[PDB]
UniProtKB/Swiss-Prot annotation, chains A, B, C, D, E, F:
InterPro entries named in the record: MoaC (IPR023045), MoaC_bact/euk (IPR047594), MoaC_sf (IPR036522), MoCo_biosynth_MoaA/MoaC (IPR050105), Mopterin_CF_biosynth-C_dom (IPR002820)
GO biological process: Mo-molybdopterin cofactor biosynthetic process
Species this chain originates from: Geobacillus kaustophilus (strain HTA426)
Cross-referenced Pfam families: MoaC (PF01967)
Active site: 129
Protein name: Cyclic pyranopterin monophosphate synthase
Family membership noted in the UniProt record: Belongs to the MoaC family.
Top-level taxon of origin: Bacteria
Gene name linked to the record: moaC
Amino acid sequence: SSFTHFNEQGRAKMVDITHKEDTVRVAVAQTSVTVSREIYEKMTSNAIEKGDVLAVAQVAGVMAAKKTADLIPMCHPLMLKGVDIAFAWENDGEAHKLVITATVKTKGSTGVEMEALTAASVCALTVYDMCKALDKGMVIGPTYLVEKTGGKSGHYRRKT
Amino acid sequence: SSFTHFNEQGRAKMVDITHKEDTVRVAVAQTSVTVSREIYEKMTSNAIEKGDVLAVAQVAGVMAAKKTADLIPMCHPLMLKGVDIAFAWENDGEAHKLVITATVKTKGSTGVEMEALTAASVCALTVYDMCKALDKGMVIGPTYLVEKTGGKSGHYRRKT
Amino acid sequence: SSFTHFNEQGRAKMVDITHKEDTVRVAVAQTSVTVSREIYEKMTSNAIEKGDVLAVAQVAGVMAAKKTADLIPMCHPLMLKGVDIAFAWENDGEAHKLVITATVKTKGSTGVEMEALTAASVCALTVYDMCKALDKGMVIGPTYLVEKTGGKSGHYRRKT
Amino acid sequence: SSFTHFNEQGRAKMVDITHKEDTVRVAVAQTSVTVSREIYEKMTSNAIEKGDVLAVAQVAGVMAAKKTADLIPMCHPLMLKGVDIAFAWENDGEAHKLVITATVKTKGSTGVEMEALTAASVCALTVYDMCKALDKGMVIGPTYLVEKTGGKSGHYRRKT
Amino acid sequence: SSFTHFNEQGRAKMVDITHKEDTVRVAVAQTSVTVSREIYEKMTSNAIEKGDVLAVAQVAGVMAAKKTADLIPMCHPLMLKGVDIAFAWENDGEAHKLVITATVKTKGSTGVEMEALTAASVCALTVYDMCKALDKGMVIGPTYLVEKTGGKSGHYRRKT
Amino acid sequence: SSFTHFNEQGRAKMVDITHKEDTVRVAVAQTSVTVSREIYEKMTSNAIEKGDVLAVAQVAGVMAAKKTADLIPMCHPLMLKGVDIAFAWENDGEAHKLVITATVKTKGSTGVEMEALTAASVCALTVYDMCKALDKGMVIGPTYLVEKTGGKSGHYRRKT
């Protein structure tokens, strides 16, 4: 086993994928934002705050998926065919945990794990930006790959 | 207490900071990447792999700090005065944990918490991109604010 | 009277504003999207379509204000202090007309008319993108400046 | 009929077009800029002002077509195969009206209506930026789709 | 003497300029494009080719000045106050040489040498892009700083 | 022979390549940075300065290849399949000359000469940015195309 993102001189390169074949590739990444009770309360009630934080974070996440190659040095620029995000409130203890799941799809010679991970990361950062006025102690993550299909390494799926 | 990023119609807005005063503001954010033993071994030895993953991730993180306003919908575009990142290998158990700490500085009417958090997040994503060929099970985070100075809310510092 | 955006050789330049003074500047721009009855009905009822088109368009508009200098060749890159957008349904006849009003604020040596106009334009384009599946005949505009304050030319205000 | 840009949770998503087939797609959009007599005179005579406003606006429009996915939240990033813009002075009354027509072409599973509309919009905004020193009362639009070919909805063509 | 763009760990950082004072800074950079006789002939006659290559290259150069921080890893994002470019045909022998001179101005705690150099470089690349259909043998450069004012290192001026 | 980047009205357009066929295309560009003895000494010894300038410049160059269409007005946005850069110190006299060679690969209907040239140019500019603290007299270039394969004009190769 060995790195693929370094060249003959030990420096970063964008791996040549010219020969590889084009297949349907999908990647699912997950992260979360743990928040204070106050933040959870204001995000789940429209009694006073009618603003939708998730709608904004969703948009940021989708747009981030498209900006992945602009942010990750060696990532290839791809023609994403689809990007969607799903939210779910959970309770990792007594604290409220917003779980974020990003799914990215494409047709090409390279996976979209980075696009999914980046979409999830920026989605979380946006939730943080929209709620930080209430509390700066919010915690993002862990962030990880849930699964990916297509490509050489076949189907990947985090064990649970 | 209340959200600041929503307008009179319950939709997202970039808060007007015209009246606020310009002061020295700093923000420190932290995250990490937990990796397999193989990834740790190849990143800490130059015997075969001479490529520097941290050098690439560092560059990505600094550039991400500058792209923060392009990624986070309601963030103000700022003239960052400084951005630096520090790395440290730790052992959150028997697994190797790369700790990433991003520090951002500026002079203005709004904090740089998002710039620091974004810098740290993309730095981590880049480490993941550079090592994923070896293992897709890497875990990023938790990501959180360590401290921030300047501004209304005074000095913030996560308790440890 | 004469152009300011052309140089000694008759080609485009970014006008030097080094000597000018920094003052509070605001700009308000307006546009609209005329839509079919079906589009209006689905955007104003949550009975089936619960998606908020305006929330997405609002985010796009704010982000576009920040990208103004990236899109308009000779515009100066500014540290926007605030950006907000307001919506209102009107009836320019028997057809439904969504009126969009973008307000941009800053502190500097140049106005933000372009930022407001661009914010409004992209906000409208986003409404169009979100509803085009229903009808491609939507009409955007007219788009124009409502008013601007600060600067040499003093206070401007479109007569009505 | 129903929206396609919203997901199972009522939030924005980039529609999956993985299954669709790749065909030749074209889109033509139109807009205009109504200007004062003075602006028209200086743009149509090289006696004193030799700067070419249309050359600058043309460049901005083409570049905007490529930035469409960066500006419109749910638009797919495409490999545009061609982008061209045409100008024509008209007289919508006694006032001078610069008509702008943008044509975008590509080969893929999704239309380029947004790319054409965005190209036209930014082209107009650039004309406004280059002439605003003379008058801020310029009016942009209406902006609309003239026609599009390829895709499910077959050939579209605005009736005149 | 020592590098300023590396941190305590030997990796890239954006130097903190928080303490420095804000002064008027200017930078002038120069480059050129050596072309074949055919390219020179078509660029200097409107008999058949009426397209203005310099107008396009000028726009690209100005826009590149603004994108400098997006391209150069450790450059600070600045509020440029002015950007202009000048062209001149010369004869570095019997071959035609288009000389490009970019001038950038700002008010801040850091010079704009990179903005001027980048503006000149992209301006040249654009001339190349517009004429490559005629010949791929065009040569760009040398590219260098002509002079800079303001800052610690005082006034710099290349000896001739 | 004639320009391809101008339309029927003598203004810039992105040439339609819809009909052309997709083939493997490669482009190799070269440039250099001539530096003072002091700069060469600090870049080739780790005795004190352990920072790797080439690692940073390499990353900037690869990322610039992907940003080519954002910088060069009429360039088509492509799905680059590979980007690599190679360095070599030479002595164009008694002065030290860092030679930079960028290779870009893709599969499509248009060459990647601009991507290679842009990658090389920004790589050089980054070396300059990282070393300018030591000397502002560094000279970049000449920059030129070494060779390109695929496409109509067949195989191109600069004579030496």
